[PDB]
Write a protein that binds this ligand. Structure first.
Ligand code: NA
Ligand code: NA
Ligand code: NA
Ligand code: NA
Ligand code: NA
Ligand code: NA
Ligand code: NA
Ligand code: NA
Lengths: 469, 469, 469, 469
């Protein structure tokens, strides 16, 4: 005479919103990462598991040697396909309710699917072939592979393209604007703003190419990697071929040698590459913050906006700073996953399950940063007057070309002579010209050196920018 | 003739729930971290900023030399106090709406508060003293200090206490249960299960003590740390004393030397300590996973629960594994914050703002782990039959006490003789006894050695457990 | 009337030996890393800088448009080549002595080379073309590229090959030896020892391939990347072509877009890949330590060797443990370099110079680990008697194939029925057979299930091993 | 008829010098870390193990209940003490030679000591009491504790004191020199150079205090922590008291609850604190590099020194950059040790042995950085002319005090009015004065505001500096 009790209730209260979320990835920045909610959330994971389970059953049906699962009629195929396509938050809630009993999420998916097909006698007939011979990780690893492939193609690389193109566009806009370079933070041989942008774009494109080349791997092969259960029931089926077909049919590259888990090395490869690109963008964010500090760039201001609570005058590079901070966090999460995921005790331990729930987290921080950098870039206005005025107060940078021309034409101790003239000393255009005048150089060379200025001492910068891409 | 437009709309859709959250801290494990939503979320932060701003105004009112802010009547004090106490998600939404204009969160709080007091003429009268002389970071750093102090006292240390007490309780339960120790993974000198628990408890208590000792610091001193604006308006007020009073009135310890920001070293100290404790718990989780693998512990099973999707027999230490994975993630976030927060360019850069929104994240993962370890511990059942049977097959561990007794009584080359007998060799009780019998030892010593067994060769283990705490 | 003083003395005392070295990479393990001393030490770096500087001068000589550096006679070519080939520790000491004056290592190399060619009037004649138009980083980045290429081809990949081959050899040796698998540390579906080795080998080969594919990059282009000085002196020479020719002539891949430094992204790519391989080897070291703990492997013992200071019986997996610890350290250094090197302020800051002196350190720890794993592997002896005896006490692992066969043949609730029989329960061969006997299965299937044993329930393990490579 | 062979030769060649060392800690910077060679090298470790072993024997001799080790005569005490005091590299070489046989370093120390006392019949008589009841880790953990205590007191804290005092000295030198502050890299409320130094000094002193407070722990208690062997041989001796006495007699704090190893949590505490201090110094190095870039500081130049291979004019902050890079490396090593050392499998695994050989490495990098920062500081010369000229071009920073004074005196919308005047706009002294003139403020307040300048708008900066320490 057991009476109704509610230990199994799965209740989503009204407590969670972007205002009360602990993580800013779902809180303050929840709107910037909305693409990931369909991919890396518990809903997204459940949805991919359902897809993989349905596809597995469908392959068993279509395989001629598995006689106990007859080929499905159009009607049946459509009902299964709709389970996948129309998978809802209510469906997810059903699975969560079942898990309150099973304390096992994939077995809950299995029981959810057995409940789903109960009313269609043709599907109900093959109900015990749902999850046939599979281990939970057969379902999970393929789900994660599909999640990462989706994220890469639909979210990550499109943002990388916007950043590369945006920075390439700064290179073009500013191709011929001279810049007093800084090495060790000190005035050095001039470049152009555009050439400094070109360098970054070039670095980013290398990683873009590498991210596309990373293999996304998947496996399907039973409890510990050897098709034991498959062969026990169907010794005459070539499960090794079946596996390769199934994985590749999902658009995933096949990993034939595994334990219970797919080993996750490809995740470390994907994430090492995202992290390199993020590091390039940290470098860019910091450099631009620095060019803004030097007044080489001004930033556009927006009506109603407030720069500082106390200092009315402030216009700050806040978008680059937000980006820089989130890329740090992204990398910290990505590095942890990359280092930790590929170590699993013996034929596996379960530490990777909770950690893999965080795939979207590391990626989330990065997406938030990408959008911020993009915002900050749209506000940049180059300060040509400042750039040129600074160059015009740094005539000592012509010590290099003077000493190099002197070397060409056999003057004794050229470097040493210019060190004497300039190191720790203020020398202006007249000072540099008088020095050139006293040199034993051919007149045409003297004329060339007297015609140089810090602002035109830019070497091949403009042509480099023109040759990019 | 401007017409209504909606660029300023702050709309929270119905999109976010625990099912669709990107982070499992708000998703799968959202229910385990509900305490943090009132502390570290955007709502929690806004709520503390409001408290600090209201308290600042109240101190200006109560200070006799600030004549322009007259002392508040009971009525006024109560209205301000209710703003703080009854601060709502709708209030937070007002602040977010204002931020859509200001693009500055603390100035939005200021404008929100000016709107709030507009209808009370006594408060409206001193409206321009809201945020008086303050910089945003005066408000923020004190908010974060209050958040961390709350988390420490109300959330973190209570969980640490449950774990310490729980492990101390395993020490008591199992005080006298002999264990074949393992060093380098190999059979070694016996201990007891309880003594192995005692060691862990002792380590955890050291960190508990240290976390309580960490200073939680706060400052209030204007745009760059020097009270410039305060002194400009009120040169005769001792702002240095005012600062110390205000900070300490909030229950925070005073940091008198700062730039625009509080430097965050105390956050690194708090987090380094949480990380050490988490590392001790990783060690414990891994060791218990190992004792379960060896069958020294069985785990209780629950009706309806599923151990494996394919392997019906499985009972797995899933709670320890979940804990172990989340403690890794906790530490990775905590370490990043600890290393990054205390470096800020010149009088500050804004990278710390977005990073500090993640204080609850590192703490969230740890809380999820603490609860899991606690769950896994409640399921442990010691397997005395297995422990004793293993000891009874490892008589070679008596080589140590035999050789040490031989050393006491002047027998030549004792270690070397036992190495010869036992290293790489199987020796049972009869083999060990026959060896003892052939030794030139006093009879009472021979009798003592013949009476030892691996299971009683436990030294001072039981008394150590009894002396703990 | 200045008198002799000794501020410039460069004195190498007798203080440093492997016994007194602070780092164990030069101390305790100095003999394991002797290959790196010719590559990554200050001597090795100086030697490569000298090579690059000499090669630069030689290209200027051979270029028809640089008329001021006439083509070198055979005599001259040979004297320059010998400077490079016969570069000595005394030469390095000369450079260090010069640096005591210059406080600049590359300018010291330049002055060292000007001193070296002073006695050959043909070389002395073009003395001011040593380092012509170059910046220190033109010399350094190419040196580091040559160092990394040498390390990869001569040291790293050969060790990776020994490990891959060694582990593949364990796969072959042990192909058909059944193993009770462990998932979550618990008895699971059997595999073979050889198949577990095969998985690791397969993972390692993926990284081997990737390390070979990483680009090793170099640049040469003057103070800030734009050939400014080159064009100032020789505007009619195509320096962009000259650069590509020179870099590729050294066997390095060309990086055309740089600041003063080569940006170091390729170093992060090389090191991310070494780190993934090291992580795979940590996983292997830990698993083997675990198989040794379980007594699945015994280790061979050596005459005179001591297992423990106190416990005469001990034979420990010390080589795997040494490897595991050093791979941790390797990864920590490699990760730091990978994350830090590619961020450099504006056209560069000097933080990368001291950090790049540590390239050999991260690599050193890894080499020490590789040798240790190799040593530990040479000592492994499989314990077939233990492996088989364990399998024979774990008949519950046949619950999986029984339930899967039941699913094939339409028996109701197969998983649930086996969960009832086995979860948390001891069932032996007779218990499993009696259960099978009571099942409504075709006789041939019943006979197949009654003929299975944990030791033969190994699926496709043996054929997988045979198909590897 | 065995013939002489040389498998046991321990040969230190002539290969290793500072020029050929792989690590720059023994190579390029070998001279900066010479203090650590007596502490953390293999020689240093061997020397401390010898000390601990000799002290253990001496306590057994002096204990009245251990009748088999008679109290030592003065002669004997002196011979043992000299073994410790006069321990040589030849002695270390003897131990290494023995290890070629034992493959066990502590047993080699034991055999080395048995050989050492063989000629003194009184010591030879108690030869089998060398290492009595001890496990290797009893000897090792106490050695490491003594190494860390020595490093802390003799090396680390003295350098921290030099840095704190040096920075405090910059605070004094520059107390009243106004600085245009930068927040988000943008011109903000002025401070003084000295006050910016004071903040850093204050942070460093907090860590200095904390490093002194960290407990340095040690244990002595046999193979697995329970005195098993001690009690087997001497059941009537109170070993728990003996342990506490012995450890504290060495000047180490007692850790009574351990496995085979001391758990290393105190090492994580020491290293977390060094890392916080190093992070404060990274912040300082970066800020000073930035003040040098802005020309707020010039650096003194030295005769003969070279700033750049190509750019004769360069004077670079190379000492701060060297420091910054080495502090990164220090922290990476320290963090790895702190995270990894306290996790050891069951009653211990041997991964900590090789890792603990690196204690001096993390500390080495830090020492190299400390010396560099000290060098760079000795070269600083403040550029008052530049600092003041910059302030005089940044009159917009007076928007803050103007708006705050306006708030005091009830002017409508003060912040908003100053935002309108200054945000994104150039306003000079005349512009600011004309704005003040038009304000409805009391004349004395108008006069105060008209008398302010960016250079005197420094609030309480000077008094703060005066109050430091
Ligand atoms: Na079929
Ligand atoms: Na594994
Ligand atoms: Na008042
Ligand atoms: Na700072
Ligand atoms: Na030529
Ligand atoms: Na850069
Ligand atoms: Na005695
Ligand atoms: Na442990």
């Amino acid at each position: 005479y057991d009476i109704p009790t509610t230990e199994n209730l799965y209740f989503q209260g009204s407590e969670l919103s972007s205002l009360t979320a602990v993580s800013p990835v779902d809180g303050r920045y929840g709107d910037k990462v909305s693409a990931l909610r369909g991919i890396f959330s518990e809903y997204g994971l459940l949805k991919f598991r359902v897809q993989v389970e349905v596809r597995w059953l469908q392959k068993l049906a279509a395989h001629a040697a598995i006689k106990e699962v007859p080929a499905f009629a159009a009607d049946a195929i459509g009902y299964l396909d709709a389970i996948v396509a129309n998978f809802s938050e209510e469906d997810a809630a059903r699975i969560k309710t079942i898990e309150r009993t099973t304390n096992h999420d994939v077995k809950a998916v299995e029981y959810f699917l057995k409940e789903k097909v109960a009313e269609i006698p043709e599907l109900h007939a093959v109900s015990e072939f749902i999850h046939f011979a599979c281990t939970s990780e057969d379902i999970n690893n393929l789900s994660h592979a599909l999640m990462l492939k989706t994220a890469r193609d639909e979210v990550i690389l499109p943002y990388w393209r916007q950043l590369i193109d945006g920075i390439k566009d700064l290179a073009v806009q500013y191709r011929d604007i001279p810049l007093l370079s800084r090495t060790h933070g000190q005035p050095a041989t001039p470049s152009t703003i555009g050439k400094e942008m070109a360098n970054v774009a070039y670095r980013m494109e290398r990683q873009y190419r590498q991210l596309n080349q990373v293999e996304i791997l998947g496996k399907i092969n039973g409890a510990v990697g050897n098709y034991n259960a498959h062969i026990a029931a169907y010794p005459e089926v070539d499960w090794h071929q079946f596996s390769e077909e199934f994985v590749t049919s999902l658009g995933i590259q096949w990993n034939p040698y595994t334990t219970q888990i797919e080993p996750h090395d490809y995740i470390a490869e994907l994430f090492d590459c995202v992290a390199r690109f993020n590091t390039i963008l940290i470098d860019f964010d910091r450099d631009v913050w620095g060019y803004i500090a030097l007044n080489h760039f001004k930033q556009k201001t927006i009506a109603g906006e407030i720069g500082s609570s106390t200092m009315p005058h402030k216009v700050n590079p806040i978008d680059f700073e937000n980006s820089e901070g989130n890329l740090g966090l992204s990398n910290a999460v990505l590095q942890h996953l990359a280092s930790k995921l590929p170590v699993s005790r013996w034929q596996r331990d379960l530490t990777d399950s909770t950690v893999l729930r965080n795939l979207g987290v590391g990626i989330g921080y990065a997406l938030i940063a990408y959008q911020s950098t993009l915002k900050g870039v749209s506000k940049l206005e180059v300060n040509r007057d400042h750039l040129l005025d600074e160059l015009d107060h740094n005539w000592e940078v012509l010590a290099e070309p003077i000493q190099t021309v002197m070397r060409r034409y056999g003057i004794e101790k050229p470097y040493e002579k210019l060190k004497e003239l300039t190191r720790g000393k203020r020398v202006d255009a007249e000072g540099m010209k008088q020095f050139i005048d006293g040199l034993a150089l051919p007149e045409e060379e003297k004329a060339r050196l007297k015609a140089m200025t810090p602002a035109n001492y830019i070497g091949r910068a403009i042509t480099m920018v023109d040759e990019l891409k």
